[PDB]
């Protein structure tokens, strides 16, 4: 994990996203209330690009946490923009680290694919509630989940990469019986389920369009950065999208984004709300675009038909960073109440 | 990280699709199936159990099958479809941290990685070989080598072109970054531009090479017996000397390495026929190893007897144990000694 994010040239792959940036530059500057005069905690500062930006708008000092070798980056960067004076580049877990004072802001950017992958916010709160006085404010403030049907020919695509493989397995396994003389045919269950696993069964990182969406968004979950915990991290959500189009259309899996919002506290408030969607946008990408759930068989729907969903969101067992999904979907007709049940399960990796 | 990739199926198919390595492997145990006929064997980690069915095929009275990954389930299963049972006991572990019912004659498996060295999956055959196997024993393969040979490659333009658009890039983003947002991003200039020379040029990349791509000698870097090799013996240096054939005029790219391995059994109980497994320059024969290509930061010209005099050393990075480096270090000197051009790169294996 820490491994990927120690290259320069991954770093910049993030600060090239001006949807990303613009978002968190606006967040600052349109509130350098937050910031006059003021300690901010920048958690996992990386290039330590938002720890320069709050002490451009004015924080006294600024403490830019970062784990990986980057640390020495952010300091040359700081040190060669002028700022050294306010920022101070500390390297280390900030799970591990200990600050001389408490911190009026928490500015970071925690949010992975589908917003939860890497688990990055439990190093967050980890920080708030060490650090944030009684009084502090939080960049983002709120965080918010969203899941819709979609109709996408991506499904296809994985469905016909599923049956090569299973094409190719076969002509293998004959290959191999003809030569060497072993049968390999009672492994052919566990390498079907292996490939369903990975051509099916894993989310799917797509630039969906705002056209290939087929039914009234829901949102998953909501969040307060202020107040989430661990705890609340692995979630259960039942929720209903209605299809809008002719019908005519198919459902070929489910898509699923986040909002962020930077507010302020209900008693600190932002002079201006600004907000990072990641919401498909026929303009606008980010590097998250979103995460598609593809359909093992895809299924006919009218509008007006009613999606009744049940999902369920734990982090797995081998690896707390990935996400497991488990999805039921009751369809239900216009008229109450035919169906078209079933149960799968994703992996975000 | 490592094991990983072993417990997948998919993969462990690509390997058993490598007709050059089953050929080899299948044939060195038929041709003599004398070692054995009613022998007990040792195959350290067996994957889909294909040695160890072989082996059993070929007579064994028991064999081990040993696999430290989930994948040890499906051997298992794979040897009890093909009525081995019997003969074959598939056990779930590492063959560092398992002991036997017994001592073993013959130690097989496939233990070579990229460049013969990568993964160094041959210290846990020492290993199972030190405590298991007995005086008369034999082993397969029963020697290795490793070559290396100068070569002519245009993937050493295809890279620094590969360099020189990351860095075009770089100029822009930092000068996008001033223009909106406020930040110079200049101080991160050199260090950015390592890490692309480190990633693109001192990485060794897989290659399927000509041997017309070859412009000088090869030469043997180590030679390995496999019978008492020690896992010290394993960082190596080696000095050698190459001489530029082609050389009418050609330019130099950068090396290929690859190794041999062969079975010949024991002086004491050779092989009815010796098998050869090797992954030079082929035209014909394609292996999954291929071969690992080191490029060159700068071409050289080079003529009729001009004299690579290379002086290498391998060894483990400290990070990872499983992975290599290699100083390479090259004097070169025309036919008409000298005059000169010498450099010095260290190469990454990933
Ligand atoms: N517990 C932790 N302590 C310190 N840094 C952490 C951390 N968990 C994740 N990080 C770091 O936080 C960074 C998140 S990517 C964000 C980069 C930068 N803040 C930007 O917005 O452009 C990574 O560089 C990662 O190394
Ligand atoms: N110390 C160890 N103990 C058990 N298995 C090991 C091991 N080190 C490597 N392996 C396993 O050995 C295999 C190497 S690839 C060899 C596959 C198979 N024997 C064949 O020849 O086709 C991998 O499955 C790897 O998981």
């Given at each position: 994990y820490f491994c990927t994010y120690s290259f320069l040239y991954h770093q910049k792959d993030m600060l090239s996203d001006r949807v990303r940036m613009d978002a968190y530059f606006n967040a600052v500057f349109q509130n350098k209330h937050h910031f006059e005069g003021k300690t901010v905690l920048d958690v996992g500062?990386?290039?330590g690009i938002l720890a320069i930006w709050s002490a451009q708008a004015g924080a006294r000092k600024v403490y830019a946490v970062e784990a990986t070798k980057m640390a020495d980056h952010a300091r040359a960067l700081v040190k060669a923009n002028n700022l050294d004076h306010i920022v101070e580049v500390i390297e280390g877990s900030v799970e591990d680290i200990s600050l001389p004072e408490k911190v009026d802001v928490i500015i970071s950017?925690?949010?992975?694919?589908?917003?939860?992958?890497?688990?990055?916010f439990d190093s967050v709160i980890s920080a708030r509630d060490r650090?944030?006085?009684?009084?502090g404010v939080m960049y983002p403030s709120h965080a918010r989940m969203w899941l819709a049907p979609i109709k996408s020919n991506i499904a296809d695509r994985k469905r016909n990469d599923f049956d090569g493989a299973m094409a190719d397995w076969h002509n293998f396994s004959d290959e191999i019986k003809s030569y060497y003389?072993?049968?390999?045919?009672?492994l052919t269950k566990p390498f079907a389920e292996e490939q369903e696993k990975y051509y099916i069964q894993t989310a799917m990182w797509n630039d969906l369009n705002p056209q290939q969406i087929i039914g009234t968004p829901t949102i998953v979950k909501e969040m307060d950065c202020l107040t989430a915990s661990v705890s609340e991290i692995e979630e259960v959500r039942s929720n209903v999208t209605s299809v809008i189009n002719?019908?005519?259309?198919?459902?070929?899996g489910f898509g699923g984004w986040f909002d962020v919002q930077?507010?302020?506290?209900?008693?600190?408030?932002?002079?201006q709300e600004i907000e990072l969607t990641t919401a498909p946008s026929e303009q606008h990408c980010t590097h998250w675009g979103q995460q598609v759930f593809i359909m093992s068989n895809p299924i006919n729907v009218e509008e007006g038909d009613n999606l009744n969903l049940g999902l369920l969101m734990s982090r797995s067992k081998?690896?707390?960073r990935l996400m497991e999904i488990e999805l039921n979907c009751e369809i239900k007709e216009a008229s109450g109440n035919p169906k078209e049940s079933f149960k799968k399960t994703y992996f975000i990796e």
């Open positions: 500062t990386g290039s950017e925690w949010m992975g694919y589908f917003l939860l992958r890497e688990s990055m650090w944030l006085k009684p009084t003389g072993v049968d390999m045919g009672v002719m019908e005519h259309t198919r459902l070929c930077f507010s302020g506290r209900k008693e600190d408030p932002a002079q081998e690896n707390h």
